[PDB]
Design a protein around this ligand. Structure first.
Ligand SMILES: *CC(=O)N1CC[C@@]2(CCN(S(=O)(=O)c3ccc(Br)c(F)c3)C2)C1
Ligand SMILES: *CC(=O)N1CC[C@@]2(CCN(S(=O)(=O)c3ccc(Br)c(F)c3)C2)C1
Ligand SMILES: [Cl-]
Ligand SMILES: [Cl-]
Ligand SMILES: [Mg+2]
Ligand SMILES: [Mg+2]
Ligand SMILES: [Mg+2]
Ligand SMILES: [Mg+2]
Ligand SMILES: [Mg+2]
Ligand SMILES: [Mg+2]
Ligand SMILES: [Mg+2]
Lengths: 231, 10, 231, 10
């Protein structure tokens, strides 16, 4: 592809520049190029990949929600709202497919540390979840199952291999709880997971790490905020 | 109000 | 082009949806499609065109400035910063060329009301000005002359045909003054134009229009703010 | 600080 001729180190460098310039589509392209070199990503590099694609898909989800709301309200009319919602939807699905493709073809492996394996399986769950937000019919049930299965595998590893305050473990649990509440229509499972996650993190607060405690405490608060919203 | 997921924070 | 099969009214409708969804590249593409139908744009439609392209080029300018600043600071080093700055620059120039192409091929005419003629010539000045921000050498002198000539023609029409509080007249004068200060390195001309514009608007304040006085008074304040900055 | 130009509002 388009990044084939560029050195890995140069792609990482340009991803960082694109982040500074708030050029997230470019950032995502650079990081895809870096992934396709076929070497593992470090923690910091996984962050770049994550930030880039989350920004791109986040803009699409926000746009999709606006248009879907106009559409639903207009179904209480020409084809234009539906057409444009479908256009944005198609682009969103394409970005999710790209991410899921990278995860499957390059990033998800049996080897590597717990952090990397959990992070990538969390990411697989997230991008299936984003597909599930716009899916209908047959496709939707399948997508939801794929999301659940990725999250559950990530959860199994995180509980065995990571401290209960680890930010990836916490972020995974937060996102899985959101899946349960918003996607799978299982509020009780959502509440239970979020409560267990928060309580176990507090009980072993001493496991906070010097280099990530700010991220941990932020996710702990987001768990508490959802618990307040859901009860 | 949607549930909050993991933020895109560096 | 890609919007050739879509009805004009549908393109306008979708531009409005894209604006609501903050999808400004889409908005710009829809409005380009509408322009290419070859009918005049109304005031409201000119607004959609303006908002869309200004958002797109605004993001590119902001990104270019970040990268240019990193570049200058790194020249106190591999090629990556320069390469990526050039990439963003090339895209920005592409957008300006698109806009200038639309203005020349479709929108700038001898006929039509004063508002439309002034608006399009102002827009021509602005997009040459954006080209001038990133230009060098012979290309730059040509670009600056083109910007000045567009603005001056717009000014001549506005002073003959529009009240001194008209928001297009004021916005043109504001932007031409910025050209003088930031591009043409003529602070005295900038100050003089901004002062004259503000004072003449105040002197004939009674010409404010019921449907645009909020825009007028906003530009008047921006003239004052620049005058405070420049003195 | 850069001079302010016409904003992208209406
Ligand atoms: C070390 C490693 O692999 N990391 C750290 C950063 C990141 C990229 C995104 N996450 S996350 O989704 O698990 C997460 C995001 C935000 C926050 Br505040 C958080 F605690 C976790 C892990 C890859
Ligand atoms: C009637 C007409 O042709 N209009 C009204 C809106 C607009 C689109 C952009 N301008 S402008 O650049 O002259 C301008 C922008 C903002 C403000 Br607050 C302003 F007063 C003027 C005119 C086209
Ligand atoms: Cl469409
Ligand atoms: Cl580049
Ligand atoms: Mg390489
Ligand atoms: Mg669809
Ligand atoms: Mg204990
Ligand atoms: Mg046609
Ligand atoms: Mg040195
Ligand atoms: Mg150049
Ligand atoms: Mg001089």
């Amino acid at each position: 592809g388009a990044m084939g001729s560029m050195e890995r180190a140069s792609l990482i460098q340009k991803a960082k520049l694109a982040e500074q310039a708030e050029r997230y589509e470019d950032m995502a392209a650079f990081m895809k190029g870096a992934v396709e070199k076929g070497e593992e990503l470090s923690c910091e590099e996984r962050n770049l990949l994550s930030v880039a694609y989350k920004n791109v898909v986040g803009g699409q989800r926000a746009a999709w929600r606006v248009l879907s709301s106009i559409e639903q309200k207009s179904n209480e009319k020409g084809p234009e709202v539906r057409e444009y919602r479908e256009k944005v939807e198609t682009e969103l699905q394409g970005v999710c497919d790209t991410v899921l493709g990278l995860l499957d073809s390059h990033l998800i492996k049996e080897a590597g540390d717990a952090e990397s394996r959990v992070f990538y399986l969390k990411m697989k769950g997230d991008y299936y979840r984003y597909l599930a937000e716009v899916a209908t019919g047959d496709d939707k049930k399948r997508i939801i199952d794929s999301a659940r299965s990725a999250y559950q595998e990530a959860m199994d590893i995180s509980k065995k291999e990571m401290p209960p305050t680890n930010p990836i473990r916490l972020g995974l649990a937060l996102n899985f709880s959101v899946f349960h509440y918003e996607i799978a229509n299982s509020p009780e499972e959502a509440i239970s997971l979020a409560k267990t996650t928060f309580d176990e993190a507090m009980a072993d607060l001493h496991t906070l790490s010097e280099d990530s405690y700010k991220d941990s405490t932020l996710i702990m608060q987001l768990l508490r905020d959802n618990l307040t919203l859901w009860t | 109000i949607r549930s909050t997921s993991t933020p895109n924070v560096h």
